[PDB]
RNA sequence: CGCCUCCUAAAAGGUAACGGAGGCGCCCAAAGGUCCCCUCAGGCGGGACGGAAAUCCGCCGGAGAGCGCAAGGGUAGAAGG
RNA sequence: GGCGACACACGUGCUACAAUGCCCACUACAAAGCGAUGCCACCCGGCAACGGGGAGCUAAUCGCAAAAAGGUGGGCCCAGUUCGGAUUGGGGUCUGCAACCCGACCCCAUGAAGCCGGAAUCGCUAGUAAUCGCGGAUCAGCCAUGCCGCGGUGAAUACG
RNA sequence: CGCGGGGUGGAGCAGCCCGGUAGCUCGUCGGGCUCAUAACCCGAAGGUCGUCGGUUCAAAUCCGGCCCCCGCAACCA
RNA sequence: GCCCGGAUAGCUCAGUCGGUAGAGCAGGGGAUUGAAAAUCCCCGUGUCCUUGGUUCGAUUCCGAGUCCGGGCACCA
């Protein structure tokens, strides 16, 4: 379908685009504009010339699914290499952005270990 | 982050020392109390014992640490787990 | 929800303005 | 037999090419594509979903040829599989279906591979035999995302008359196999 | 070939995401694809398709060198 | 305590001991008959999941596999599939 | 530098797990305070944060400042969702001498748990609960969901 | 060492016969209730099931050897 | 070997002399309770062991078989 995945036909293209990893409401709200595509049309409600327009466009606008995940892990990979404090947090798998490490770090630490 | 409208803050005396050893070539391992500065591309190839609160921790400056603060690579806290 | 910066309501509860809460 | 334009490429380009690069003193010395083995080590219908004829359905759609069943060569405890037990499909793609499937493979499947950085330039048997793996089967144009129900990749055994991996990867290279490195 | 087991191929109309037609022999007469070799990145110089920077790090020292010295 | 295999057991057979080892008290309606077809173990290397070992492929293998169950004998130029 | 750690455990809060909802746009309706190196109208640039200008205000008159929920229309159509925003990557604005530990805010992307929660347990009897938003103190900044107040809507129930 | 039996999570025990998955009580930990403790409640975790070899695709679960324990017997003089 | 007994809700067992598969036990939930509880309210779930035949229909009735249990013997 599109760059990495398929959009849900019964859903409008707006949320469908955002289903692409590497695309939120913003780029979803924009690529339809640069491709002049009506967002209200469901994914099943999409013509080929529209999609190929949008497909080639968005696929040529931003790295979305795989290439994006490359740099993401890459950015954290390169962090872990230099040994920055941030890299320390990742290599420790602890809250990287100054969160209160003592409590409420389950999102970074997962299950509890009492 | 520091506003790019504002200059890249770097502790001048430490920065100046780096520019000094540049003329004098890579040598004179620099102890620094100046955790807060950002590494400058000149600083690459140098080394600094960055002060960690009690100690000056030696850090070799590579290009992978240019756009960062000095103190980042000096972990001010020592953690080892529990038990 | 109220904790979403991207939501206008979030900036409302945040009491700020961004791309999604004009002034 | 029918026509397959890629095989045509092999005769027209690949044959004179390898004759050039290598100077085979007899045309039966240039490498050739023996067959393409398609394996799927399912390991799922061994106990449950015993009619995985959806699998042979997909393989038939991909090759126009219903594959063979590979059964339990002997029971295993660690793997919940006793002997005499279907664990995998397999087919022997040959001349027509061989060159056809290869044409579809280079032309469609590889470009549809996710983050396809190319093929392993080292996945060689040594005997001028290349292998690889898949993490799904919906890569092919025959298979639509609707019809596909569960990703089952595979391993594909491209066999070649050549003896060395050098002449082999020479051959496939001439065929334009996108090598990753 | 066991005559009646093998799903029969036909002249296959392949259509790329670029609409690039690659006619071959497949079980379905015409089939669309989101990509061809003539459009896949790995064949077209990779194009970078989003980012040709190629390891922006380290610098890329924009807003740098403005030090007073 | 009956029968099977081995050593005891001295290159025929047989050959004792409360001698050294183990098995059997069934099973297969196919594990039988015939015709036809195939050849293993194992190792390497490559191969999505997938491993040490699933299935695949190529490479080397005389039998070291298998042959319903103890051992022995027999055995792929098949008794094995 | 630490008071910000962090396998853990408890208290107190906020946000939620959705359609009596969520998002968008327009349209309303307050109170109470604050403000001269401060509110900053308004204008421009900027996706925005914000920055460049810039009047008035020296306070019922200038501004903060829009109340929000509410109402209209639109979308979503039960979906881990246009729910959820946690985390994280990156790019920025501002303050600050300096935001690595250790600030906030903007933008992009990421989109965690969570489907109303065991044992247990809390508050509330009226403009109360509940819910919505607004101001001030400290403060350059803000780690404020806190605190103190202010107002909008606005309940059920009390046999005993 | 003769014969029978047994040796499962921290404790006691169960699953062995029939090899496919080991459960109960107590106990541990966390929380709850209490002014605190006990009791009680919610919740969770927690087992080469003696050793070593063979059987088996696979062994606590089959077989053998070993160790420990228990029991019975160790006589006719 | 002979005789007879039942195969029913997760269980126990009802079961038509053919119109319906049900009582309670277990399960869950609701109220319930300080815990324990009990209680209470409501849902739980079946080829009526299989085959057949009959009659409009058969859980029923029945022929067979199996399991199933017991007894009654006999053992060269
Ligand atoms: Zn194309």
Curated annotation (Swiss-Prot), chain A:
Assembly, in brief, is:
Part of the 30S ribosomal subunit. Forms a loose heterodimer with protein S19. Forms two bridges to the 50S subunit in the 70S ribosome, contacting protein L5 and the 23S rRNA; these bridges are straddled by the 5S rRNA.
The entry's family comment says:
Belongs to the universal ribosomal protein uS13 family.
Superkingdom is Bacteria
SUPFAM superfamilies recorded: S13-like H2TH domain
The protein depicted here goes by the name: Small ribosomal subunit protein uS13
Which InterPro entries does this chain map to?
Rbsml_uS13_C, Ribosomal_uS13, Ribosomal_uS13-like_H2TH, Ribosomal_uS13_bac-type, Ribosomal_uS13_CS
Span of the secretion signal? none
Cystine links in this protein are: none
- Give the keywords, sorted: Ribonucleoprotein, Ribosomal protein, RNA-binding, rRNA-binding, tRNA-binding
* Function description: Located at the top of the head of the 30S subunit, it contacts several helices of the 16S rRNA. In the 70S ribosome structure it contacts the 23S rRNA (bridge B1a) and protein L5 of the 50S subunit (bridge B1b), connecting the top of the two subunits; these bridges are in contact with the A site and P site tRNAs respectively and are implicated in movement during ribosome translocation. Separately contacts the tRNAs in the A and P sites.
Gene Ontology CC terms: cytosol; small ribosomal subunit
What Gene3D superfamilies does this protein map onto?
1.10.8.50, 30s ribosomal protein s13, domain 2 (4.10.910.10)
Per the record, which residues fall in region Disordered? 93-114
For whether the record's keyword set contains tRNA-binding, the answer is yes
According to its UniProt entry, one GO biological process term is: translation
Q: Does the keyword Ribosomal protein apply?
A: yes
What are the GO MF terms of this UniProt record?
rRNA binding; structural constituent of ribosome; tRNA binding
UniProtKB/Swiss-Prot annotation, chain B:
Subunit details:
Part of the 30S ribosomal subunit. Forms a loose dimer with protein S13.
Question: What is the organism lineage in this UniProt record?
Answer: Bacteria, Thermotogati, Deinococcota, Deinococci, Thermales
Which Pfam families did the record assign?
A: Ribosomal_S19 (PF00203)
Question: What is this protein identified as?
Answer: Small ribosomal subunit protein uS19
Q: Does the keyword Cytoplasm apply?
A: no
State the GO CC annotations.
cytoplasm; small ribosomal subunit
What is the scientific name of the source organism? Thermus thermophilus (strain ATCC 27634 / DSM 579 / HB8)
Query: Tell me, which GO biological process terms does this entry list?
Result: ribosomal small subunit assembly; translation
Similarity section: Belongs to the universal ribosomal protein uS19 family.
Cited Gene3D superfamilies: 30s Ribosomal Protein S19, Chain A
HAMAP family registered for this protein in UniProt:
Ribosomal_uS19
Q: Which SUPFAM superfamilies match?
A: Ribosomal protein S19
Q: Does the keyword RNA-binding apply?
A: yes
Q: What does this protein do?
A: Located at the top of the head of the 30S subunit, extending towards the 50S subunit, which it may contact in the 70S complex. Contacts several RNA helices of the 16S rRNA.
What keywords are annotated for this sequence in UniProt? Ribonucleoprotein, Ribosomal protein, RNA-binding, rRNA-binding
InterPro entries, per database record: Ribosomal_uS19 (IPR002222), Ribosomal_uS19_bac-type (IPR005732), Ribosomal_uS19_CS (IPR020934), Ribosomal_uS19_SF (IPR023575)
UniProtKB/Swiss-Prot annotation, chain D:
Q: How does it assemble?
A: Part of the 50S ribosomal subunit; part of the 5S rRNA/uL5/uL18/bL25 (TL7) subcomplex; has also been isolated as a complex with 5S rRNA, bL25 (TL7) and DNA binding protein II. Forms a bridge to the 30S subunit in the 70S ribosome, contacting protein uS13; this bridge is straddled by the 5S rRNA. Contacts the P site tRNA.
> What domain of life does the native source organism fall in?
Bacteria
The function of this protein is:
This is one of the proteins that bind and probably mediate the attachment of the 5S RNA into the large ribosomal subunit, where it forms part of the central protuberance. In the 70S ribosome it contacts protein S13 of the 30S subunit (forming bridge B1b) connecting the head of the 30S subunit to the top of the 50S subunit. The bridge itself contacts the P site tRNA and is implicated in movement during ribosome translocation.
What's an example GO cellular component term for this entry? ribosome
The protein's name is: Large ribosomal subunit protein uL5
Q: Which InterPro entries match?
A: Ribosomal_uL5, Ribosomal_uL5_bac-type, Ribosomal_uL5_C, Ribosomal_uL5_CS, Ribosomal_uL5_dom_sf, Ribosomal_uL5_N
Any Pfam family the entry gives: Ribosomal_L5
**UniProt GO BP:** translation
- Identify the keywords attached in UniProt to this record, alphabetized: Ribonucleoprotein, Ribosomal protein, RNA-binding, rRNA-binding, tRNA-binding
Family, according to the entry, reads as follows: Belongs to the universal ribosomal protein uL5 family.
What is the scientific name of the source organism?
A: Thermus thermophilus (strain ATCC 27634 / DSM 579 / HB8)
Task: Return the HAMAP family for the record.
Answer: Ribosomal_uL5_B
Curated annotation (Swiss-Prot), chain E:
Protein name, UniProt field: Large ribosomal subunit protein bL31
Q: Which GO terms describe its cellular component?
A: ribonucleoprotein complex; ribosome
Please name the Pfam families in this protein's record. Ribosomal_L31 (PF01197)
HAMAP family, per this entry? Ribosomal_bL31_1
Identify the cofactor(s): Zn(2+)
Q: Entry's Gene3D superfamilies?
A: Ribosomal protein L31 (4.10.830.30)
Q: Name one GO molecular function term.
A: rRNA binding
* Residues annotated as transmembrane: none
Q: How does it assemble?
A: Part of the 50S ribosomal subunit.
Sorted keywords for this record are:
Metal-binding, Ribonucleoprotein, Ribosomal protein, RNA-binding, rRNA-binding, Zinc
- Quote the record's cofactor note: Binds 1 zinc ion per subunit.
Task: Name the residues that bind Zn(2+).
Answer: 16, 18, 36, 39
What NCBIfam families does UniProt report for this protein, alphabetically? L31, PRK00019.1, PRK00528.1
So what does this one do? Binds the 23S rRNA.
Swiss-Prot/TrEMBL GO biological process terms: translation
Q: Which organism is it from?
A: Thermus thermophilus (strain ATCC 27634 / DSM 579 / HB8)
Q: What is the lineage of its organism?
A: Bacteria, Thermotogati, Deinococcota, Deinococci, Thermales
Q: Which family does it belong to?
A: Belongs to the bacterial ribosomal protein bL31 family. Type A subfamily.
Record has Protease as a keyword: no
